[PDB]
Amino acid sequence: MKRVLNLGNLSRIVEGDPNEITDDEILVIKDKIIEGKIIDIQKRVDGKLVSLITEKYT
Amino acid sequence: MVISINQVRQLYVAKALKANTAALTTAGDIVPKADTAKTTLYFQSMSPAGIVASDKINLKHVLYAKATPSEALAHKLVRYSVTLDADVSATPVAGQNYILRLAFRQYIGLSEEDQYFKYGEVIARSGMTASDFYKKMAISLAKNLENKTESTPLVNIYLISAAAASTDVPVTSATKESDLTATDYNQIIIEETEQPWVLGMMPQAFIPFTPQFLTITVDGEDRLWGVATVVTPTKTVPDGHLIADLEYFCMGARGDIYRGMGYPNIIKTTYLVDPGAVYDVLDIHYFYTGSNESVQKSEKTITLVAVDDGSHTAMNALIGAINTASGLTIATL
């Protein structure tokens, strides 16, 4: 057990508009219908804002 | 209800129209009197204490004469419509304090520097549909507004089911969620109130309000969660109290101006306006000029009030008789 990233790279975990998320920062999309849950973690790669969570099916 | 006068204003009530002065029996009977020519106009008004008569109007010196339809004096209660802002979100976001701020102007004072604020609070939960939010928001408003120990009644809260869309359902501090059972509550209505009124003491007045919203944190930014719309009202004040306070004031130009001040040592004045009815108003303006050096005018206003049956029947009868006896052409209602 140890920390996952230096706090410098964790201070750039933000909550905002997908259109203003550049690199050197990760995006979190909070859920509305559910209070504490999250919807997706996102990271831009080539202008597109892709997810870091692998899709899981039945 | 003190008003401004162009050197004077007098009031006479027309509870019934007569043909001659030999028929003035009841304490509201009136009749217009004028010469066989058209040189002077005056009214024989039956008072509760005998016949009287207005000042004499020189028809060469009549400035303006016009009636009102009794609906130009009704005050429509300012109605609002609160709603969730679809742009932000068409539903509440769990974990956010959906506060509402009712800003009141013309609180106890009479200026607008005299302000007063009343709040509502709804902390949203997961799965809180919109109807439940409006319900809980309306109730929080009622509770915070009408605490049994809150002197002035400020606003009336309402709710509208999307099924009806017209029949607003009330929400009092005695109301309970159990009483509000529907699930398609579309919006929250807020409306003015007829403040208390006392003849000669407490004039007809209202407290203006505007629903102001507080910020919530939607996806990343602080944004207002609602919409304060000014919808067309559906309720009026029937003008009865304005005329009563008008008579109260305009009968001091014709009598006791103290109206109760030195209490045991007063005169008792009777009033013929029924506050609770609705009146249509006739108003005449004119002036008096003197001779060689006394050319200065003294403008005057003689005011009449009749009862509006909805068709302006009585006031039309007055205007007919006045025009027949004076040659004027006061336009009917």
Determination technique for this PDB entry? cryo-EM
Distance from CA of B185 to the nearest CA of A (A): 19
Spatial separation of the C-alpha atoms in residues B149 and B34, rounded to whole Å? 59
Interface membership of B264 toward A (CB under 8 Å):
no
Backbone angles phi, psi at B305, to 5 degrees: -140, 130
- Among B89, B126, B220, whose Cβ lies nearest the Cβ of A35? B126
Spatial separation of the C-alpha atoms in residues B245 and B305, rounded to whole Å? 13
Q: From B88, which residue of chain A is nearest by alpha-carbon distance?
A: A32
Contact between B288 and B56 (Cβ < 8 Å): no
Q: From B220, which residue of chain A is nearest by alpha-carbon distance?
A: A16
Contact between B213 and B102 (Cβ < 8 Å): no
Q: Which of A26, A35, A37, A40 to mutate to test the interface with B (most CBs of B within 10 A)?
A: A35
For B131, B146, B147, B183, B328, the CA distances from B175, given in Å and listed in that order, are 16, 11, 12, 16, 58
**Cβ-defined contact of B219 to A16 (cutoff 8 Å):** yes
- Among A29, A33, A34, whose Cβ lies nearest the Cβ of B219? A29
Which pairing describes strands B29-34 and B16-17: parallel, antiparallel, or unpaired?
A: parallel
Contact between B38 and B282 (Cβ < 8 Å): no
Q: Which residues neighbour B49 within 8 Å (Cβ) at sequence distance 6 or greater? A: B270
Interface membership of A16 toward B (CB under 8 Å):
yes
Interface membership of A15 toward B (CB under 8 Å):
yes
Distance from CA of A30 to the nearest CA of B (A): 7
Contact between B115 and B105 (Cβ < 8 Å): yes
Burial of A23 (0-12, 13-18, 19+ CB in 10 A): exposed
Q: Which of B126, B128, B217, B223 to mutate to test the interface with A (most CBs of A within 10 A)?
A: B126
Sort out which chain B residues have CB atoms less than 8 A from A36's CB and list them: 95
Spatial separation of the C-alpha atoms in residues B141 and B139, rounded to whole Å? 5
Which pairing describes strands A13-14 and A26-30: parallel, antiparallel, or unpaired?
A: parallel
Q: From B130, which residue of chain A is nearest by alpha-carbon distance?
A: A33
Q: Which residues neighbour B88 within 8 Å (Cβ) at sequence distance 6 or greater? A: B216, B218, B223, B224, B225
Contact between B266 and B113 (Cβ < 8 Å): no
B284, β-bridge pairs: B65, B302
Sort out which chain B residues have CB atoms less than 8 A from A17's CB and list them: 219-221
Spatial separation of the C-alpha atoms in residues B242 and B245, rounded to whole Å? 5
Taking alpha carbons only, the member of B200, B282, B189 closest to residue B244 is: B200
Taking alpha carbons only, the member of B79, B78, B177, B80 closest to residue B131 is: B177
Report the first-to-last Cα separation within chain B, whole angstroms: 26
DSSP B270-302: -----BTB-EEEEEEEEEEE-SSS---EEEEEE
Contact between B105 and B208 (Cβ < 8 Å): yes
Q: Which residues neighbour B179 within 8 Å (Cβ) at sequence distance 6 or greater? A: none
Burial of B223 (0-12, 13-18, 19+ CB in 10 A): middle
Report the first-to-last Cα separation within chain A, whole angstroms: 30
Burial of B244 (0-12, 13-18, 19+ CB in 10 A): buried
What HEC string does A28-44 produce? EEECCCCCCCEEEEEEE
SS3 B36: coil
Interface membership of A19 toward B (CB under 8 Å):
no
Distance from CA of A18 to the nearest CA of B (A): 10
In chain B, which ranges are E strands? 10-13, 16-17, 29-34, 40-47, 50-53, 57-58, 62-67, 79-84, 100-105, 115-120, 156-161, 169-171, 185-191, 209-213, 215-218, 221-224, 226-231, 279-289, 297-307
**Cβ-defined contact of A36 to B125 (cutoff 8 Å):** no
